[PDB]
From a paper:
Follicle-stimulating hormone receptor (FSHR), a G-protein coupled receptor, is an important drug target in the development of novel therapeutics for reproductive indications. The glycoprotein hormone receptors represent a subgroup of GPCRs, including receptors for three gonadotropins, follicle-stimulating hormone (FSH), luteinizing hormone, and chorionic gonadotropin, along with thyroid-stimulating hormone (TSH). The receptors possess a large N-terminal leucine-rich repeat-containing extracellular domain, which interacts with glycoprotein hormones (GPHs). The binding of GPHs to their respective receptors on target cells activates the Gs-cAMP-protein kinase A signaling pathway.
The atomic details of FSH bound to the entire extracellular domain of its receptor (FSHRED) has been reported. Surprisingly, the FSHRED formed a trimer, an unprecedented oligomer form for GPCRs, in the crystal structure. However, it was not clear from these data whether FSHR functions as a trimer in the native state. The trimer structure was crystallized from a PEG solution and determined in the P1 space group. To test whether trimer configuration depended on the particular crystallization condition, we crystallized and determined the complex structure in the P31 space group from a Jeffamine M-600 crystallization solution. The trimeric arrangements are almost identical in both structures, supporting the proposed FSHR constitutive trimer. The FSH residue Thrβ60, at the potential exosite of FSH, does not interact with its primary binding monomer but potentially interact with the neighboring monomer. In our trimeric activation model, a constitutive FSHR trimer is only able to bind one fully glycosylated FSH molecule, in contrast to three deglycosylated FSH molecules binding to one FSHR trimer.
Residue numbers in the entry:
A (entry chain X): 18 to 282, 291 to 294, 334 to 338, 342 to 356
B (entry chain B): 1 to 109
C (entry chain A): 5 to 92
Amino acid sequence: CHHRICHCSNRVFLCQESKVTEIPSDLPRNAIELRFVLTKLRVIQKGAFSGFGDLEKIEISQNDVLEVIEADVFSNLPKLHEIRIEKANNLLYINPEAFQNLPNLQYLLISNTGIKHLPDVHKIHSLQKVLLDIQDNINIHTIERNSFVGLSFESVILWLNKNGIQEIHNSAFNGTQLDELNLSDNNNLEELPNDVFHGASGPVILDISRTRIHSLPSYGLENLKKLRARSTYNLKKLPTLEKLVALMEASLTYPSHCCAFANWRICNKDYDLCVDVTCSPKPDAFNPC
Amino acid sequence: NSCELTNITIAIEKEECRFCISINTTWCAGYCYTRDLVYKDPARPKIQKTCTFKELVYETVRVPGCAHHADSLYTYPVATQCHCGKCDSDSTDCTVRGLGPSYCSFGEM
Amino acid sequence: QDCPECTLQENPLFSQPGAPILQCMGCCFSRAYPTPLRSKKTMLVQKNVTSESTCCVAKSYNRVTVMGGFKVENHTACHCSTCYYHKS
Ligand SMILES: *[C@@H]1O[C@H](CO)[C@@H](O)[C@H](O)[C@H]1NC(C)=O
Ligand SMILES: *[C@@H]1O[C@H](CO)[C@@H](O)[C@H](O)[C@H]1NC(C)=O
Ligand SMILES: *[C@@H]1O[C@H](CO)[C@@H](O)[C@H](O)[C@H]1NC(C)=O
Ligand SMILES: *[C@@H]1O[C@H](CO)[C@@H](O)[C@H](O)[C@H]1NC(C)=O
Ligand SMILES: *[C@@H]1O[C@H](CO)[C@@H](O)[C@H](O)[C@H]1NC(C)=O
């Protein structure tokens, strides 16, 4: 296979190097995979990847002159399950109309970009379980109300770790089925408001490791099974096992918290074929319990 | 399983002199066993290993100059131990494809 | 010592006689090397090491229900593709 500027092999198109300044008009509609690496793209044009009814994967990596993702860009793609927006140091803005109806989306990666805000996902409406993985985006400082509603009709995994988050609004997770939520390595994050988990299932897994979070909310943790709070020094007070009923594993900071989980606590049939809280740090060298 | 210390050739790019220098070093490459889970439970063990550095060291090499631009120093990491484990997102770029260890903006081998 | 390729195998837990459950499992190529400077120019957060990795995942499947009530996948095809759960 051969294209004017993009390298091609088995309906897979890799558009690499500085010679690539605009997304080619002559890209075959049958394309399965489309990659844009090391390009001198300044903007990804309004409705650029619309029409590729076969296209299942998109990659936008290592583009140092990309600044904006226009409206209607990720539209008319019934077969797309994966988008990867990686290493885009000058990408500051994403039009709240960029992510359109993507019914088979399974993975959205936004890593190491300069984006000032989270992506607008209310128009995705995927039929699939979605993994929204947003990491190393130091210019993202706030998760606003209803940030993930309409992303999926299915349960969702939300990796919002290693960004620059310091504010989380009430109901930020409303109208969402939260499977897993990772807020770790957002060091400036000082508090989890009480209505953070308002109108949201779960999460089953929560990671607040290496955060200045002082306390957990009174409700919303009724489904929490795994809590990861490594180097979460501002906590010190945890909810009672009457509130964390579902909790079965917990990797915390203070060994005093583990002592409280010990000494207190079937199904028809490595694998968990279905007993107490698997807590750490658990040292006996100093206790105190 | 078959993740081990392999010999590689890397490119050190002196942008100002419009060339790269080749340096044979030791890094990681090989195969790791993975399992795609059949039962998608939120508390399931969704964990995948990759072939990557277990421990590393930094090495400084003298990169030549040309004209109007003097010879500089460049520090690069070297694999010391490889393992099939988690990709350390803190230090590593955990991706599908990179530009290649011997990537140069001005040539090839 | 060797690493068998990513292919369909019978799931021990969910499989039953006459009705096995097929799962993608095996080995895929993954590597690591220092990040080229060209890449470092596009990274707002610097990463000195670069990991290129692929994982054993189902190319296609069919949602089924077994052992009274378990919504499990019966994998029909496998390939080494994108790793979603390999990072720390
Ligand atoms: C919560 O989400 C629903 C849609 O799922 C919406 O109708 C409602 O206004 C939202 N509530 C708040 C508090 O924003
Ligand atoms: C790597 O290269 C060095 C020097 O050429 C050699 O001693 C060594 O045997 C090679 N093999 C491995 C696996 O490191
Ligand atoms: C080291 O690099 C040279 C190129 O400079 C290459 O030809 C050779 O295979 C490498 N290994 C040894 C042991 O010289
Ligand atoms: C899984 O797929 C195999 C092959 O298509 C089939 O024989 C088997 O009946 C399926 N298992 C279930 C539980 O439907
Ligand atoms: C990363 O590499 C650069 C030089 O290439 C250096 O400034 C930095 O200290 C290295 N080490 C770490 C741990 O980032």
